[model samples]
Target chain A: RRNTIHEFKKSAKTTLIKIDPALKIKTKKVNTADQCANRCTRNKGLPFTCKAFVFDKARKQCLWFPFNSMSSGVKKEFGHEFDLYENKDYIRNCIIGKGRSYKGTVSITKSGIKCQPWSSMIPHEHSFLPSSYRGKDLQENYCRNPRGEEGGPWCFTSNPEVRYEVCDIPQCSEVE
Target chain B: RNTIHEFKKSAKTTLIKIDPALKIKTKKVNTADQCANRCTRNKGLPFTCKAFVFDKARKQCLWFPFNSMSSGVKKEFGHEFDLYENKDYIRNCIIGKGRSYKGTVSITKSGIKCQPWSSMIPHEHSFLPSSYRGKDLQENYCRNPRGEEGGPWCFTSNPEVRYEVCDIPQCSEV
Candidate 1:
């Protein structure tokens, strides 16, 4: 009972600010947000391990995510269709100081770790679904700020194909 | 200073068998002391060596990953086996020695912290016995006091003997 399901609340009109298209590992057709959440919960191991998921109500679709973080931004966009549920314990671990750095896939903060992607976040999206990456195809990078939102851990890398370079993660209050 | 040998062997049939699933590794050795030394190295399968069963007849040693006494494993009757559980876990830890364990402080996977009996609480007399009927065992014991099962704990095999640390599953997270 303790490890099976994490406590989650539905955040309305909110979604992960960034989506590295490659990281959305699975797409499923499900009727409810709870179905999507359960799919994410049961998915374990690298590449398919679900950390967060968005249920698109309009399309009757579930988009599973690999990472969840407050460091990522959120915005309104047809907000009624996209409802998000994230792993509660993963976020709690970040707050309690068990945060880990970008370990190839997941981004961990005092909040939670990220899931691994099948490929680059951008290219993965382009092949899977065009609308998600149509306009946001700019410089690809992973951002982190350990001191957080006063936020020095943020940076960008132009190469979308790269995984975790030591420079991609925050260190010593500066990019090393 | 008294060593682990101070705990007199009550009988040979108190066979502490570890769960087969949690048994990490085993070896053939000459003595129970050699089995203990190999288990205590902290580099091998018995990462937190808590108990061991030595086959005195065959000179074979089996190391357990958990303290067999407090870890819910069944005790069996094996005529050839000599079971030795760490006295620290039994709360009869030897105190003040050039040879007393100065090993790294460790927390078992179950979250119980390893600590010395003398450091656990204030005490007046040394726990070493004179006549053997004693109530001084409580001072050497450690417990969460709220009856928390997963929290820090010590053991009393029965109402008769002194409480010892069931010092396994070192306090990790609630």
Candidate 2:
């Protein structure tokens, strides 16, 4: 469900070392990286903005920071077990309700399957054509709920087995 | 490129609305582009320039501490005037009093849902979209039309409570 909450852009195999002493980073011991992502997606109790997170697989620890490398003096260094994932700005653009107006770049299904291009009828074919749904933003292979389905944004799966599946995007009203 | 980032422009609205009473720093400029360029620099101004009205007809560039979103203004249609806002102040982060904040955050601090500005619902207020113009009072997003010290606030969907301030971080905090 962490994937449904946040589309974290994995930045590097690195860890952050704070240069500024004033900006305190929140940390937690977790069993896995997904637990760290869960805390970041909630992001309520943290005193600062959760722009990025550094998960150390070696110690199974999570470190959350208010500022990214581009914004603050926080330095990033090579760490074998460290994986830095940045929370993208696209989360700010989550669709609401049925999400017929969902214009996000989430081209993958909830089960980590790639979406078949709407224009292409390679493995699966349907009437959710790009030209047909004019204002539905059916450009490229992005997931969309053109027919206003109860499953929210969905697309024809690239996998030959599955015809269509719902995307894991969150609703705007779900924000804290 | 990041210096003068993004701004919401009004093609048909401007200072002619004459609703809010915030101070205006008037300056003569050759073009509307020059007016906007100087506004981004934010140098030699009395207050941090959150918004500005460029008079394309008279070449009059009027800088204001507040934007059309402020409580006192209406969207007066005038072809000669146009309004532009500094993205640094108007976006998700707060600056000074958080008056021109137009980001789409609609939750209250205590986890209460915000009542729509248009809907009377369980609570009611005068922060209507028709009166406030480009203030983006459509949804229940938290706003500071009156420039409150506590930052962006909104009428609550909660029946018992009236309104509460939202948790928007300051831009300076970055």
Candidate 3:
């Protein structure tokens, strides 16, 4: 009797990042950072709310931090860097701060930090077919001929394992 | 037929101020009439730029006469106050024992200056809009809809101008 078991590797194709929004107000620098913090604390419960406060030298406007987000802890000294941001974008991805090439999670990882739609993030369907196979022009432009339309690259075929590109680069090679 | 076209209570107008930043550069407080007099007196001389001096109590901001638009000074003072045209007798004035106020009485163009809390003067012609003025302010103006039909959506036929490319040579007045 022969037992069939194999180990394989997979990698993410792209990286993701997240951004926040900007709050508008006319602010004037009165004193120390404590004063700024106190100003924000004073106006905490009002309908007219202000979050983080920064003194803008260019506009001469004391700008108030607007985002009252879920996370307010000032960890790792990232105080005013990206916390008080302009509101042009919303969260559409998971673990955007973890940086690129995340493969698996540890036993103590955040439950909502997965890339899959089942893990709180939005789910989007993607095609595994090569560029040539998906569209005639795309296939013709890439992969030299029309080989991308066929489905598999060299080794992966219909499975997520054993995939390699030209020059025999493995999918797991880029994993950190 | 209705000389009384408009009247309404509105937010008190605010004025630009001499910047707190430029408060260190404070020189003098030139009233609007003084500013105008200086401008006219020095007409045809050259352009000047002045910092805006503001009185918070009066909620008035004005260009200091000592600082003129043609002065070419690029320092910021504060904000600009709304100066009523033709009726420019310091509408919004800061009054106190320190700021040109005497004996609890401040003066106006109406020829009587008395009681800080009383002695009211009614304007012959009010510029404010009356009780009803239609304004849909709740709509989000995140972006200005200058070219959109009826804004966000609508036909141009409803008391509005339509966007059409009519040639001047090919079209005639009705």
For all the predictions, what are the DockQ values? 0.02, 0.02, 0.01
Stretches of candidate 3 above 4 Å error? A1-24, A44-47, A57-61, A65-176, B1-174
Worst 10-residue stretch by lDDT in candidate 1 chain B? Answer: B93-102
Q: Pick the candidate with the highest lDDT.
A: 2
Q: Which stretch of 10 consecutive residues in model 3 chain B shows the poorest summed lDDT?
A: B165-174
Candidate 2 — which residues are off by over 4 angstroms?
Answer: A1-6, A90-176, B1-101, B105-133, B138-142, B147-174
lDDT of 2 at A36: 74
- Please, what are the lDDT tens digits per residue for candidate 1 over residues B12-93? 5344444455544677777776776554432344234555777778888666654433444666656787666643233221
- For model 1, the stretches where C-alpha displacement exceeds 4 angstroms are A1-6, A17-21, A44-46, A71-78, A94-176, B1-174
Give the winner by lDDT: 2 or 3.
2
Ranking by TM-score: 2, 1, 3
Candidate 3 chain A: 10-residue stretch with minimal lDDT:
A1-10
**Model 2 lDDT tens row, B122-141:** 88777888888656675677
Q: Tens-digit lDDT track for model 3 on A1-176? A: 11100000111121112143332343564544344444553333222234334433333333444332222222112222222321111111111122221111111111111122111112333343343233222211111112432222122111123122211111111111
Model 3: what TM-score?
Answer: 0.16
